[PDB]
């Protein structure tokens, strides 16, 4: 136990209580760790004292037990390995990187300041961003210099957008471990299937992302310690589901990432769990530079102007930009910069980023808002530009036109293309899928249309997804439907399941176009829909998905025609 006990219940057995070690015990532990080599041990010996004084300082400073001995031991291990590989005295940058990786994760603590206070290494102050640390954890540069598993603390589960974009840019994508949002499947059997998937990923070496599944910790408690038994060179770790405990094989390439909200961790997460994992905080603000954040502010202002003006019901951004929320502009900017690449800052890059962001936001706007902006701007240049882009350079007239444009213009490297669509009209029926087939014939097979609510269990959804993915067609179009009445859990779980299954059926270079269509109401029912999930997804609003048999008119034609002329 890590918590205290009552002696009377122990039946007068033997009770041993361990106290927090002093500096000498910590330095002896460090020397024990380094004993495997003598040169490196001598080199780091000087640093051991400062590391121990820093650790006791941190432990007395922090309010709640958040850092512990595992962090200190991991620091010593990482410095030992760095020196061993370098064959030279540990450079300041390495000590800084070790300290940041181990003792980061909290705001109220300034670890690096404490550790630098004891040393003259502060001269470096070349700080390393959480993205670099997370990369080094997942892809840390024969030897099992194994780093701890990652815990990413985020806000509004934003972290998932960043990682998918940055590190998993290609199809090396990890597997998402999450709680299902379908009505009849989240119970014990779901934990059983999840831990089965964790085991299979350990055996195969596929990296895993743990979403809000802290309730699975009792199954993983022993693996997180990463104390392994060995057989024939391979390492094994213990896993449990109930009273059954078994040893399972861990592929060296295996890594674990837990994504969780900062407040859940601070309040609810047990302290030994916080100690077992290497902790980092990730939010869009931690990725964006200053000028990118400035672009975010500019886009928020441009939005506010777009809503009202360059009577006057005083619309809000959510009522115009479907799915808008506090972080929409930041997500858009991140997606833009990530697609552009690492190109250096230039006036061209600044302008192009701003314009791309505006275009993406506009793609989710209602035609009604663009018309309002033009009318109330009396035909301003900006209004006509935006109308041109929306009505002519974009494909909001129907779903068939969007699909044709996406099929023709989309990239050829991205075998899996993900799209999110919002609409106010009626969802697609079989007749609409037939029309789409008639348009697509010669390019892809009949689009497969599924309604997420019709599914009561995740397994039936996976079965149909696999039925579709298993066809030999080089191009596949998958369409999922939902009516937003609660629901967001279903959409998220379906999204994750589809991503995982696409990652699994990947040996072929088939090109899969995935569309998620949500039917909303202009007024609503209180709970505001949230889009702009960014990452792999592209958010497009289509007011009406049908091809308008009642009028073949594409708007911006009627804009210069009277009702009298209609009856000519």
């Amino acid at each position: 136990s890590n918590w205290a006990l009552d002696p009377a219940k122990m039946n007068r057995g033997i009770f041993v209580s361990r106290g927090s070690p002093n500096e000498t015990e910590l330095i002896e532990s460090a020397k024990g760790i380094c004993s495997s080599d003598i040169l490196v041990q001598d080199r780091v010996q000087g640093y051991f004292a400062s590391f121990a004084k820093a650790y006791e300082t941190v432990c007395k400073r922090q309010d709640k037990e958040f850092f512990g001995l595992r962090d200190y031991y991991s620091l010593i291990k990482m410095v030992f390995a760095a020196a061993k590989a370098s064959n030279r005295k540990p450079s300041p940058q390495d000590i800084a990187q070790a300290v940041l990786r181990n003792f980061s994760g909290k705001d109220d603590i300034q670890a690096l300041d404490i550790f630098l206070a004891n040393l003259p290494e502060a001269k470096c102050s070349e700080e390393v961003s959480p993205m670099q640390l997370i990369k080094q954890n997942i892809f840390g540069p024969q030897e099992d210099a194994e780093s701890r598993y990652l815990l990413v603390l985020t806000k509004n589960y934003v972290a998932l957008q960043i990682l998918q974009q940055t590190f998993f840019e290609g199809d090396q994508q990890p597997e998402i471990i999450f709680g299902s949002g379908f009505p009849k499947d989240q119970e014990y059997t779901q934990l059983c299937r999840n831990i089965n998937r964790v085991k299979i990923c350990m055996e195969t070496g596929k990296m895993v992302l743990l979403l809000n599944l802290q309730n699975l910790y009792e199954s993983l408690y022993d693996a997180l310690n990463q104390y392994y038994v060995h057989l024939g060179g391979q390492k094994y770790v213990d896993l449990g589901l109930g009273t059954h405990r078994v040893k399972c094989r861990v592929h060296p390439n295996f890594r674990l990432i837990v994504i969780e909200e900062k407040d859940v961790v601070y309040k609810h997460f047990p302290i030994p769990l916080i100690n077992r994992l290497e902790k980092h905080y990730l939010d869009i603000n931690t990725v964006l530079e200053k000028w990118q954040k400035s672009i975010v502010e500019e886009l928020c202002a441009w939005v506010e102007k777009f809503i009202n003006v360059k009577k006057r019901h005083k619309y809000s951004p959510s009522d115009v930009f479907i799915g808008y929320h506090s972080d929409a502009c930041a997500s858009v900017v991140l997606q833009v910069i990530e697609r552009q690449g690492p190109r250096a800052l230039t006036e061209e890059l600044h302008q192009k980023v701003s314009e791309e962001a505006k275009s993406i936001l506009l793609n989710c706007a209602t035609p009604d808002a663009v018309v309002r902006l033009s009318a109330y701007s009396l035909g301003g240049f900006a209004a006509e530009w935006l109308s041109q882009e929306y009505f002519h350079r974009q494909r909001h007239n129907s779903f068939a036109d969007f699909l044709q444009a996406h099929l023709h213009t989309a990239d050829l490297e991205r075998h899996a293309i993900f799209t999110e669509i919002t609409t106010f009209s009626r969802l697609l029926t079989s007749h609409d899928c037939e029309i789409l087939e008639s348009e697509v014939t010669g390019r892809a097979p009949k689009p497969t249309l599924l309604w997420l609510q019709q599914f009561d269990t995740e397994y039936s959804f996976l079965k149909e997804v696999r039925n579709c993915l298993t066809n030999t067609a080089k191009c596949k179009i998958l369409i999922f439907q939902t009516d937003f009445e609660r629901s967001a859990q279903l959409i998220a779980s379906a999204k994750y399941s589809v991503i995982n299954e696409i990652n699994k059926i990947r040996e072929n270079e088939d090109r899969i176009f995935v569309y998620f269509i949500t039917k909303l109401s202009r007024v609503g029912r209180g709970t505001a829909y949230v889009g702009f999930h960014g990452g792999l997804w592209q958010s497009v609003h289509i007011d009406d998905l049908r091809r308008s048999t009642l009028m073949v008119s594409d708007v911006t034609r009627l804009q210069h025609v009277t009702i009298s002329q209609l009856f000519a």
Binding site: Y188, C192, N196, K199, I200, L241, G242, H244
Partner: protein, 150 residues
């Protein structure tokens, strides 16, 4: 064992005998018959035993092999039957009387064309039997039972 349960296994849902308190354990039990040419005995398993077998399958099946098909089939049927059991329990708690002598047998694989069999123990209602895939029938039956509960 799981392969045999898929091939021969039969799940049974019935009201608690011996005045036992109503719960999933008392309501649901698994029958595993013997196959032709083999002389082992038809065993009866309790819900705890099926959950133990399931845990074993999950921890064993880490082999990146097609074996998941059988585990997946086993798991699917198990979950469906558990869902059906809770629906019965609900009708029991609400005071319904039809589902007081009602016995249902779900055949993990068709026996002479039968996948589900239901008998209410009444002279007016003859035995009900239907074929096909068990999970579709079970989902439809669960949905009807829930609508009937409301």
């Amino acid at each position: 064992l799981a392969t045999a349960i898929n091939q021969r296994g039969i799940y049974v849902i019935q009201a608690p005998k011996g005045g036992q308190k109503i719960s999933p354990d008392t309501v649901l039990h698994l029958i595993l018959p013997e196959s032709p040419g083999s002389h082992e005995e038809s065993r009866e398993y309790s819900l705890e035993e099926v959950k133990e077998l399931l845990n074993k399958l999950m921890l064993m099946s880490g082999k990146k092999d097609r074996n998941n098909t059988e585990v997946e089939r086993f798991s699917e049927v198990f979950c469906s039957v558990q869902r059906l059991s809770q629906a019965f329990i609900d009708l029991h708690s609400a005071g319904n009387m039809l589902f007081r002598t009602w016995i249902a047998m779900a055949y993990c694989s068709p026996k002479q064309g039968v996948s589900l069999q239901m008998d209410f123990g009444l002279d007016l209602v003859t035995e009900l039997k239907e074929g096909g895939d068990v999970t579709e029938l079970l989902a439809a039956l669960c949905r009807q039972m829930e609508h009937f509960l409301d």
